[PDB]
PDB file of N, CA and C in Angstrom:
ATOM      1  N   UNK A  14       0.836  -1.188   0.000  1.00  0.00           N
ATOM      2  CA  UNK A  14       0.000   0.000   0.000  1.00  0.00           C
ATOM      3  C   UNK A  14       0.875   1.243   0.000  1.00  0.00           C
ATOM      4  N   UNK A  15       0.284   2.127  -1.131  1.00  0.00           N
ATOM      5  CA  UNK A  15       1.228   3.931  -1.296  1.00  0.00           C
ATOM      6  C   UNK A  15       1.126   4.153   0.132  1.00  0.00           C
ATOM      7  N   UNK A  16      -0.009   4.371   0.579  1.00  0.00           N
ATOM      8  CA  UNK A  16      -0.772   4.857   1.739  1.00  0.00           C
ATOM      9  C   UNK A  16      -0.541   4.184   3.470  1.00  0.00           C
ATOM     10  N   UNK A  17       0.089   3.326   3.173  1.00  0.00           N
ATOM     11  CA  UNK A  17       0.360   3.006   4.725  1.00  0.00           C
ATOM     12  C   UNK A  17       1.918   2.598   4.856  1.00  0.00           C
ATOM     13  N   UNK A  18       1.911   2.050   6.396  1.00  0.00           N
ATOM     14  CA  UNK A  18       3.041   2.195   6.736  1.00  0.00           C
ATOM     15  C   UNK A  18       3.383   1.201   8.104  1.00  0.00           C
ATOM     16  N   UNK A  19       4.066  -0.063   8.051  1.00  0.00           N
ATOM     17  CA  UNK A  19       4.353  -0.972   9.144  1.00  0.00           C
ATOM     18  C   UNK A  19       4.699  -0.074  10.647  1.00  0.00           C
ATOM     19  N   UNK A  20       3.874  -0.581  11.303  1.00  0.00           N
ATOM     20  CA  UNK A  20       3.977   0.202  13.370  1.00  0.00           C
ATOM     21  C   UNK A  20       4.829  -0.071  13.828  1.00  0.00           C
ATOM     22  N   UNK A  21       5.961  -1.283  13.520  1.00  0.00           N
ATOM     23  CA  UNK A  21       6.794  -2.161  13.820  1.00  0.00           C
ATOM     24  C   UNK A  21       8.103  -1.575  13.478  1.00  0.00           C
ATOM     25  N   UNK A  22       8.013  -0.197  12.977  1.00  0.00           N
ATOM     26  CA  UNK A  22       9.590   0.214  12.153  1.00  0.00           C
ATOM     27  C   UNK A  22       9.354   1.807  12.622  1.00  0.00           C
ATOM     28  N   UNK A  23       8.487   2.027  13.578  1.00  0.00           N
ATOM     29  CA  UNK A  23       8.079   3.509  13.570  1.00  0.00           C
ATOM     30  C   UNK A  23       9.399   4.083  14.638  1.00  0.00           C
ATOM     31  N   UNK A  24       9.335   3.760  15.169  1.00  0.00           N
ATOM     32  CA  UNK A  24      10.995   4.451  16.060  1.00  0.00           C
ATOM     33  C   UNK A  24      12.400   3.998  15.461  1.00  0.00           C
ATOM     34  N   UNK A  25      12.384   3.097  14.505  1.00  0.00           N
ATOM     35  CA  UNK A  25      13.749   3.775  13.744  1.00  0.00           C
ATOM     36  C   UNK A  25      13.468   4.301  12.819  1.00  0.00           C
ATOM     37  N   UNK A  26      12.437   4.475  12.181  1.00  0.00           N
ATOM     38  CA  UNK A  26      12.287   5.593  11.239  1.00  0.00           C
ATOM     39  C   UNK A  26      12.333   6.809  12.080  1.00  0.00           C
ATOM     40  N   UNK A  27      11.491   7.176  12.814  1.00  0.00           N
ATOM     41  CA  UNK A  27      11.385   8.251  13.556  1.00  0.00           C
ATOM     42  C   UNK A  27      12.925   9.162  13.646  1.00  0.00           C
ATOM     43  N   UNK A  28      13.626   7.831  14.231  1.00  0.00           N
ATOM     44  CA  UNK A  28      14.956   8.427  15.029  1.00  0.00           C
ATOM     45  C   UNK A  28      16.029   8.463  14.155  1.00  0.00           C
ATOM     46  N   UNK A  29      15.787   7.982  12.564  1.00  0.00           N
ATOM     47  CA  UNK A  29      16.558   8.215  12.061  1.00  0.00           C
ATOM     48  C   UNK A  29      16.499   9.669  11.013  1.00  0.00           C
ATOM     49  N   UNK A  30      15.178  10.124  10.888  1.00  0.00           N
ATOM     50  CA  UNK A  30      14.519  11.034  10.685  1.00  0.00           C
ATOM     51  C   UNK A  30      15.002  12.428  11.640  1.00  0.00           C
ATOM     52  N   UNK A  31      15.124  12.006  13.084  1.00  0.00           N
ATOM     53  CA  UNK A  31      16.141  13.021  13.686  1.00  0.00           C
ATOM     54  C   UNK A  31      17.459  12.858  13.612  1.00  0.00           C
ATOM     55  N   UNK A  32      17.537  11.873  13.281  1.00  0.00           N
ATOM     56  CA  UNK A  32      19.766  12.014  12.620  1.00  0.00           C
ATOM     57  C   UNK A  32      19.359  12.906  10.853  1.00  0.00           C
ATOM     58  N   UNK A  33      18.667  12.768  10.406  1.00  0.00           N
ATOM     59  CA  UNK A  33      18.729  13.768   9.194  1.00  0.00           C
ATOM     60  C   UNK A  33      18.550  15.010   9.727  1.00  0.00           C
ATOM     61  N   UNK A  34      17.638  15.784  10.659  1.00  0.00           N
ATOM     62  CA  UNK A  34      17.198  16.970  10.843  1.00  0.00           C
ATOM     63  C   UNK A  34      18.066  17.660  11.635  1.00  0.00           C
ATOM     64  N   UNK A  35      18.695  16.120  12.398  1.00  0.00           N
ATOM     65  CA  UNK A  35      19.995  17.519  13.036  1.00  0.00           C
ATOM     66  C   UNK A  35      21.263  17.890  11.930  1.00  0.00           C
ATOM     67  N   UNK A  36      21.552  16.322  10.949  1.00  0.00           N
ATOM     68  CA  UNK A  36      22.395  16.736   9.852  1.00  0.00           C
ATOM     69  C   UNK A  36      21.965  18.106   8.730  1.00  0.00           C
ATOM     70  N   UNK A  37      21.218  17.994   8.997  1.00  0.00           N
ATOM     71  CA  UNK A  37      21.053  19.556   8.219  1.00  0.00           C
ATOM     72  C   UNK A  37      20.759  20.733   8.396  1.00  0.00           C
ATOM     73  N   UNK A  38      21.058  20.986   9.841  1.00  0.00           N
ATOM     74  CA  UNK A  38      21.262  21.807  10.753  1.00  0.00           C
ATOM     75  C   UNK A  38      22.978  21.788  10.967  1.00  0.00           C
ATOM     76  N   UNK A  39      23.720  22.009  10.234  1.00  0.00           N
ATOM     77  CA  UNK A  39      24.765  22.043  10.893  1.00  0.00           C
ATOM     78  C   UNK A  39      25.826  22.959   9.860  1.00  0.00           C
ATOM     79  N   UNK A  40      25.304  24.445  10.168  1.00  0.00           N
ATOM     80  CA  UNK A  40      25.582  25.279   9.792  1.00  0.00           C
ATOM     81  C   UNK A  40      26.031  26.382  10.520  1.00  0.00           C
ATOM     82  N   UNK A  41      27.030  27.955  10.224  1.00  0.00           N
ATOM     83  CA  UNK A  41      27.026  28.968  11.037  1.00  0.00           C
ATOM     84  C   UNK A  41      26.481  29.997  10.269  1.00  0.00           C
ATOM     85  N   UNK A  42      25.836  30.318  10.957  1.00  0.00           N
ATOM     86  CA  UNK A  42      25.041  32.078  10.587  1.00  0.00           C
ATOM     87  C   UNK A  42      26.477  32.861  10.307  1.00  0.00           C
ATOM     88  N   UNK A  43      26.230  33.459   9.145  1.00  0.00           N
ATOM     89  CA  UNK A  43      27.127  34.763   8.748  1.00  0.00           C
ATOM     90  C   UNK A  43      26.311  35.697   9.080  1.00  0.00           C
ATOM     91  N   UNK A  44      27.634  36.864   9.299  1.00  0.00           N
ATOM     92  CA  UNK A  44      27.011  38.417   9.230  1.00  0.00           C
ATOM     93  C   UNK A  44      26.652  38.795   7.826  1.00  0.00           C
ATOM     94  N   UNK A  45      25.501  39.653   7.599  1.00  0.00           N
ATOM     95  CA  UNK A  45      25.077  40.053   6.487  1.00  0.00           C
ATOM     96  C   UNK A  45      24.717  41.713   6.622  1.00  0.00           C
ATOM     97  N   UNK A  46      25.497  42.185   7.338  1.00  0.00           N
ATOM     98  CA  UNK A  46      24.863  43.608   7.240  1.00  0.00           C
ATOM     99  C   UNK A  46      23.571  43.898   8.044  1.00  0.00           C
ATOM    100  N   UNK A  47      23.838  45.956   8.133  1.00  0.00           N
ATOM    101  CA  UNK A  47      22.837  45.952   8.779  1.00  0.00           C
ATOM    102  C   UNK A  47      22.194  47.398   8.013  1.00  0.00           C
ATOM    103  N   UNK A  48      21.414  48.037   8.402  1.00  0.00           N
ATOM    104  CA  UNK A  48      20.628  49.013   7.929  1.00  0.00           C
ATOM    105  C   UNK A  48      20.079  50.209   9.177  1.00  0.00           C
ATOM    106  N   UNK A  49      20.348  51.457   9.501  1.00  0.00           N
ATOM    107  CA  UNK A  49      19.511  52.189  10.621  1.00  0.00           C
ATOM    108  C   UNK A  49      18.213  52.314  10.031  1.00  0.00           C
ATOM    109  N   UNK A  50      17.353  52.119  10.669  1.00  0.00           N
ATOM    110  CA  UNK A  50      15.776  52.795  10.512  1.00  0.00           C
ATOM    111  C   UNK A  50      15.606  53.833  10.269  1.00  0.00           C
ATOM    112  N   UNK A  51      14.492  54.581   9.580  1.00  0.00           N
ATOM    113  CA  UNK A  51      14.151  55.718   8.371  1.00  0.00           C
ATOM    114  C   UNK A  51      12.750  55.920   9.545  1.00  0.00           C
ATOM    115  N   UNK A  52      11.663  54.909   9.253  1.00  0.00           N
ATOM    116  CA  UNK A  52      10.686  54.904   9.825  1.00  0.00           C
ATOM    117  C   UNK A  52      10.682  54.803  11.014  1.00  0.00           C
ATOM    118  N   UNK A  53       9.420  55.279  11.440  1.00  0.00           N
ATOM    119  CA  UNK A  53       9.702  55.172  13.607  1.00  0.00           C
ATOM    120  C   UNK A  53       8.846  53.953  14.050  1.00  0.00           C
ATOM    121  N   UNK A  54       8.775  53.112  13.426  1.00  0.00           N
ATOM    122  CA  UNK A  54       8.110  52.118  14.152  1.00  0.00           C
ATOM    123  C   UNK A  54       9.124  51.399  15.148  1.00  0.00           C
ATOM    124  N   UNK A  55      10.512  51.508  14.853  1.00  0.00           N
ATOM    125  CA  UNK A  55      11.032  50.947  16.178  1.00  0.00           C
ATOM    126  C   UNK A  55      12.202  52.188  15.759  1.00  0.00           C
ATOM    127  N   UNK A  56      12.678  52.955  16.895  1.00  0.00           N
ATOM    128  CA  UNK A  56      13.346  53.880  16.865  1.00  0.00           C
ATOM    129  C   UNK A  56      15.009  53.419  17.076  1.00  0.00           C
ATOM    130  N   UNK A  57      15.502  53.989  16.234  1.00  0.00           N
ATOM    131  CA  UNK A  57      16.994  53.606  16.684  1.00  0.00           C
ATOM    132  C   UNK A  57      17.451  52.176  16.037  1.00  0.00           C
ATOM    133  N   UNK A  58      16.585  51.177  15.461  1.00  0.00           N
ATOM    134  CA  UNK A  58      16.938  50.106  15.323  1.00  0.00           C
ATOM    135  C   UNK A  58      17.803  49.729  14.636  1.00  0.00           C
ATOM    136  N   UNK A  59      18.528  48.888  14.515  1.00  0.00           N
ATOM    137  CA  UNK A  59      19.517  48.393  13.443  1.00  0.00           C
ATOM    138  C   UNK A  59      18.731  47.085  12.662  1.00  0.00           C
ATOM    139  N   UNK A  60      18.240  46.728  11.398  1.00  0.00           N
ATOM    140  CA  UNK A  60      17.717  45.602  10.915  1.00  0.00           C
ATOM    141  C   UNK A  60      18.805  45.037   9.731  1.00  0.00           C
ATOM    142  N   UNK A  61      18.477  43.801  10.106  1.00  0.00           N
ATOM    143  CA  UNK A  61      20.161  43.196   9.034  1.00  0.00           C
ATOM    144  C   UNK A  61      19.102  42.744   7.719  1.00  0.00           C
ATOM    145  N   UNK A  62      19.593  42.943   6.559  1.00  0.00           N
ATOM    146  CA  UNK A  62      19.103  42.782   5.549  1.00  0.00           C
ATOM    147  C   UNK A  62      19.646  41.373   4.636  1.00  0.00           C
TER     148      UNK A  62
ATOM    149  N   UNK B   2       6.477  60.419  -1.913  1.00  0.00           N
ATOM    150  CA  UNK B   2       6.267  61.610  -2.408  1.00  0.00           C
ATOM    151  C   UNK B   2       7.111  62.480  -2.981  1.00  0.00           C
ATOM    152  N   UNK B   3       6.670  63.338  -3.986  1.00  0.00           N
ATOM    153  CA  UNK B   3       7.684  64.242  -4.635  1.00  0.00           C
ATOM    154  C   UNK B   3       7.814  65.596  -3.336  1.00  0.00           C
ATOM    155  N   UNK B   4       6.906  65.783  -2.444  1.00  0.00           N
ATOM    156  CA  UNK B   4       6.580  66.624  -1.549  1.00  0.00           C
ATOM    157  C   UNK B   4       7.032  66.309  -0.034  1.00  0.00           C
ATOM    158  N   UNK B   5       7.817  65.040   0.261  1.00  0.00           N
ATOM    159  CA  UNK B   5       7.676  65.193   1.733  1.00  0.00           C
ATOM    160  C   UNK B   5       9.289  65.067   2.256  1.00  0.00           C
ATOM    161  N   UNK B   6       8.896  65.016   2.961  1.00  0.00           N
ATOM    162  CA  UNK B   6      10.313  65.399   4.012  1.00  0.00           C
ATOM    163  C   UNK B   6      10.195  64.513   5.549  1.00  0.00           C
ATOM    164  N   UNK B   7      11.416  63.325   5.711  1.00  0.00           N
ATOM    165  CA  UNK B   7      11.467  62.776   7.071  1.00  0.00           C
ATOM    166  C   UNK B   7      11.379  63.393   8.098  1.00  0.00           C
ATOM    167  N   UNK B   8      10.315  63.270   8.949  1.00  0.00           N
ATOM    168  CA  UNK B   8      10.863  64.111  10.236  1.00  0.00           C
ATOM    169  C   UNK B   8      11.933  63.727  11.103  1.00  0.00           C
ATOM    170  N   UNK B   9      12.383  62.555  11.402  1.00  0.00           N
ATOM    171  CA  UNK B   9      13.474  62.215  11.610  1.00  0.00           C
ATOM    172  C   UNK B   9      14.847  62.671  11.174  1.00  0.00           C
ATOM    173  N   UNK B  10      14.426  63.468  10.009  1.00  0.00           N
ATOM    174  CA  UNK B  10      15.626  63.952   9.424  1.00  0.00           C
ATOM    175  C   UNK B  10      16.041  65.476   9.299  1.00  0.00           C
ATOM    176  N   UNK B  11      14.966  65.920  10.278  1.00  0.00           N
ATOM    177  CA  UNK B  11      14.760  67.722  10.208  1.00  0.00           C
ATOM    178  C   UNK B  11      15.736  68.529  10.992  1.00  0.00           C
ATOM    179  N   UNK B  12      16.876  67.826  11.912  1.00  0.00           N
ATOM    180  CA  UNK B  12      17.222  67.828  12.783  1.00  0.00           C
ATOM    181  C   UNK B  12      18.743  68.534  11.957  1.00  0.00           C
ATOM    182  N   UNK B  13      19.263  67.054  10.910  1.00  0.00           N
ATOM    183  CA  UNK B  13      20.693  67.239  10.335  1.00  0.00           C
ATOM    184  C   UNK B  13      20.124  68.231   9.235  1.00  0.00           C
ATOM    185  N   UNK B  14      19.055  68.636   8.973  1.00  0.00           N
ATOM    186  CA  UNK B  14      18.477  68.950   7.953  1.00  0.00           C
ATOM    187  C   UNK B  14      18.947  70.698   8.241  1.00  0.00           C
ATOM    188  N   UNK B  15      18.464  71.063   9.132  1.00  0.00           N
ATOM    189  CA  UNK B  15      18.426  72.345   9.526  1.00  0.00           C
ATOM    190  C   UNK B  15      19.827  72.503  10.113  1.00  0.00           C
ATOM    191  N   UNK B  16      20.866  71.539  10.557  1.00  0.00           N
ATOM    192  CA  UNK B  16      22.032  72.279  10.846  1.00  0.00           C
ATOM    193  C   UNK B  16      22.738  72.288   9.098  1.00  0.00           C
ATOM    194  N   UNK B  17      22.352  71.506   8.285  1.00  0.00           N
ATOM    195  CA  UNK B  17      23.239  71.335   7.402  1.00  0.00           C
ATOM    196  C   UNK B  17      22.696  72.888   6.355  1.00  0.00           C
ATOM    197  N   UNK B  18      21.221  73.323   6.497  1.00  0.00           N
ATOM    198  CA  UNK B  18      20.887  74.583   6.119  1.00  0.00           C
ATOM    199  C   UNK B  18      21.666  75.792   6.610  1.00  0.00           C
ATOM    200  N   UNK B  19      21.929  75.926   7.493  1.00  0.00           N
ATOM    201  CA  UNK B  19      22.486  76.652   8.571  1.00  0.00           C
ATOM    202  C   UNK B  19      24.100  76.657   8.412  1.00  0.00           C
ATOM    203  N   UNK B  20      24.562  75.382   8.184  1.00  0.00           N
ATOM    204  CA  UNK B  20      25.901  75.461   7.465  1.00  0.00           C
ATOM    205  C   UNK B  20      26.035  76.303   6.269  1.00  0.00           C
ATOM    206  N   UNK B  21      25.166  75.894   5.052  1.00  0.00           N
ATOM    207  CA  UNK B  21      25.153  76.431   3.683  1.00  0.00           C
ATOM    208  C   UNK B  21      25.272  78.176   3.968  1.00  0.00           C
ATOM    209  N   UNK B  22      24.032  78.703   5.066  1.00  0.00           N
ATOM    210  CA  UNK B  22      24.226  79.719   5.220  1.00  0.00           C
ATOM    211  C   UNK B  22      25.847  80.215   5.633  1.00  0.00           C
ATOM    212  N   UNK B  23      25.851  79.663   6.399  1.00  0.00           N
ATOM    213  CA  UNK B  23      27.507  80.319   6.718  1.00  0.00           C
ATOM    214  C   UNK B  23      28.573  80.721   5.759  1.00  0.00           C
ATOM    215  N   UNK B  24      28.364  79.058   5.264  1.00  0.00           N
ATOM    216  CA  UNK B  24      29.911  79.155   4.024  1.00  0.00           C
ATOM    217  C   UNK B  24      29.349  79.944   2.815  1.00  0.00           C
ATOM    218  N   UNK B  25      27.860  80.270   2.785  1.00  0.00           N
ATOM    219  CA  UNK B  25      27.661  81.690   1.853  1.00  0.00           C
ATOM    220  C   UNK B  25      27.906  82.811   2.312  1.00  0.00           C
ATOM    221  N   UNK B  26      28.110  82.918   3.626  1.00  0.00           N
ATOM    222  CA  UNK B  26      28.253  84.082   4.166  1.00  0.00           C
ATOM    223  C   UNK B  26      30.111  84.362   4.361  1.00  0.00           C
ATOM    224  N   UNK B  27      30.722  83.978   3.887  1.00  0.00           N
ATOM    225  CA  UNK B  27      31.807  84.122   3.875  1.00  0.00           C
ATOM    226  C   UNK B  27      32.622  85.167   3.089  1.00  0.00           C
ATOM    227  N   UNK B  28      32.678  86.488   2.947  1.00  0.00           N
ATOM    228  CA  UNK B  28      33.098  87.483   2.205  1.00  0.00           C
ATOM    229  C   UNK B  28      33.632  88.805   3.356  1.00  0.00           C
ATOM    230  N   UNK B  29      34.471  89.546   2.282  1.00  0.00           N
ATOM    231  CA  UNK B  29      34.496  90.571   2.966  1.00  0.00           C
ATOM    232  C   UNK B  29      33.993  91.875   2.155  1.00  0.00           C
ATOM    233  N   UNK B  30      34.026  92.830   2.901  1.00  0.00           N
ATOM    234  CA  UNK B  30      33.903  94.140   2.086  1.00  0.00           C
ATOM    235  C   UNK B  30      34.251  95.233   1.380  1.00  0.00           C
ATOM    236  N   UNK B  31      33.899  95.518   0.020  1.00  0.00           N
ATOM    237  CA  UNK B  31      35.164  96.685  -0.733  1.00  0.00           C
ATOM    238  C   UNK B  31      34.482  97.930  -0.428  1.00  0.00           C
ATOM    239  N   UNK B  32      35.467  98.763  -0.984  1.00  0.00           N
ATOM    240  CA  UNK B  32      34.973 100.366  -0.444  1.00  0.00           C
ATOM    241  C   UNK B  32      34.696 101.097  -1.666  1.00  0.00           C
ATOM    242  N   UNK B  33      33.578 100.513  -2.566  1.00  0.00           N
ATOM    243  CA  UNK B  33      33.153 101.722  -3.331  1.00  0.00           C
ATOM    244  C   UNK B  33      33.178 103.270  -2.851  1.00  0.00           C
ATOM    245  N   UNK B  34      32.836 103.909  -4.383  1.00  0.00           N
ATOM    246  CA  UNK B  34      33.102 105.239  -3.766  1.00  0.00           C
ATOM    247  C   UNK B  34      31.601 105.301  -3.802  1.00  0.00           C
ATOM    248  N   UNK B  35      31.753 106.919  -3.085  1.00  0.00           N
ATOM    249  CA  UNK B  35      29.935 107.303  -3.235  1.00  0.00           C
ATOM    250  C   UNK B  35      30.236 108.742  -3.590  1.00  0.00           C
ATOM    251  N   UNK B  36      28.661 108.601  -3.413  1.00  0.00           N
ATOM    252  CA  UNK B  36      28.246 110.524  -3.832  1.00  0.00           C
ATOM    253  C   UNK B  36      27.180 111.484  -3.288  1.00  0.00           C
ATOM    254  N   UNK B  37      28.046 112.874  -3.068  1.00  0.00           N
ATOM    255  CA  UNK B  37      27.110 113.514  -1.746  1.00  0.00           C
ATOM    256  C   UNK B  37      25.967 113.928  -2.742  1.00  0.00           C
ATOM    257  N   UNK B  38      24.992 113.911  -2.049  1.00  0.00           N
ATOM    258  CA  UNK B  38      23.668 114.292  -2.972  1.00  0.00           C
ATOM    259  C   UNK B  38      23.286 115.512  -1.840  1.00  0.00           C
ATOM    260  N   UNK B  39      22.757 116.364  -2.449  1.00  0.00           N
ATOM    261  CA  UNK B  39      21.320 117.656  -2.102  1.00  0.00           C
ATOM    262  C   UNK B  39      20.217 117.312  -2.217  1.00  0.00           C
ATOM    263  N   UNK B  40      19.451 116.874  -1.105  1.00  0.00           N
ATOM    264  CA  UNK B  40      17.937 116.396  -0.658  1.00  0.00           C
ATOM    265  C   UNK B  40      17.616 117.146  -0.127  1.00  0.00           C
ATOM    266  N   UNK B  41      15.958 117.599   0.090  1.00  0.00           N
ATOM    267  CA  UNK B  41      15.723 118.171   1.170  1.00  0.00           C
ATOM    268  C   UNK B  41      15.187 117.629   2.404  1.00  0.00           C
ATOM    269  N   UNK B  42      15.313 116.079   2.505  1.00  0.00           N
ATOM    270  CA  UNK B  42      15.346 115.378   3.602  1.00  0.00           C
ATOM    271  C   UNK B  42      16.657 114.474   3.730  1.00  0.00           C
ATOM    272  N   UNK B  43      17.311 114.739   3.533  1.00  0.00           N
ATOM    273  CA  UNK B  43      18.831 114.317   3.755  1.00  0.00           C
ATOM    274  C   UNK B  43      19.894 115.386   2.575  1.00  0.00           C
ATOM    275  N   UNK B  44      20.197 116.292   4.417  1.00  0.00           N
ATOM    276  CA  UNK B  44      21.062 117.578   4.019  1.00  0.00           C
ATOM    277  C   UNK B  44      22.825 116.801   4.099  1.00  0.00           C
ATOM    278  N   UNK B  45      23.306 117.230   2.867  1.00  0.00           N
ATOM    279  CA  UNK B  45      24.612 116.539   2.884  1.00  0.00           C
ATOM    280  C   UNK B  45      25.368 115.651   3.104  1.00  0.00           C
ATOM    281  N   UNK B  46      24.387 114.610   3.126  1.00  0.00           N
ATOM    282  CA  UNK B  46      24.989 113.154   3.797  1.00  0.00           C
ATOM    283  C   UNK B  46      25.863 112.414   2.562  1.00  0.00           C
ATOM    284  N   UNK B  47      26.602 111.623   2.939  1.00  0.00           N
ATOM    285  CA  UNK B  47      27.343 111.150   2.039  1.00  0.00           C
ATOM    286  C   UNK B  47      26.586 109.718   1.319  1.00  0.00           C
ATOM    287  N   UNK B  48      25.819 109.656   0.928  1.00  0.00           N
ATOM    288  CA  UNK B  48      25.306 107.940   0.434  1.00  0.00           C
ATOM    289  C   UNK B  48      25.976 107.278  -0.249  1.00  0.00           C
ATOM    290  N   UNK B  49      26.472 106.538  -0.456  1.00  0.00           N
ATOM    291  CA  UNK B  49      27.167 105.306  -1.390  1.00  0.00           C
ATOM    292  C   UNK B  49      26.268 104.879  -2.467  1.00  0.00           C
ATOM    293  N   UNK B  50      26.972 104.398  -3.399  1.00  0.00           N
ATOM    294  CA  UNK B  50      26.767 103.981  -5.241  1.00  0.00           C
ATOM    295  C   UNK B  50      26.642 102.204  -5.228  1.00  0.00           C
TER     296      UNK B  50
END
């Protein structure tokens, strides 16, 4: 069946499903710049673009 | 708008007006000659040209 799925395999699928989601999480944020605010909805702000 | 102006920005706005004035105001003065005129509300004064 397209549509179903053995109960018997559901926690290593599961848990291997979280070994992918942390593998692709495994990155560092760069700096990208920033911008001062024009508008006053937040005063003073710095927003990174 | 073709018409508006930040208020946030009225601040550098008006010293940087205020500058322009200055560095236009930067001269000194020559000493044309003048010429005494006969009025009969200004007896012999010297007026300038």
């Amino acid at each position: 069946s397209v549509r179903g799925a053995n109960p018997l395999m559901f926690r290593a699928n599961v848990l291997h499903m979280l070994l992918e989601f942390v593998l692709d999480n495994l990155y560092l944020n760069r700096h990208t710049g920033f911008s001062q605010d024009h508008t006053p909805f937040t005063e003073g702000a710095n927003l990174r673009s």
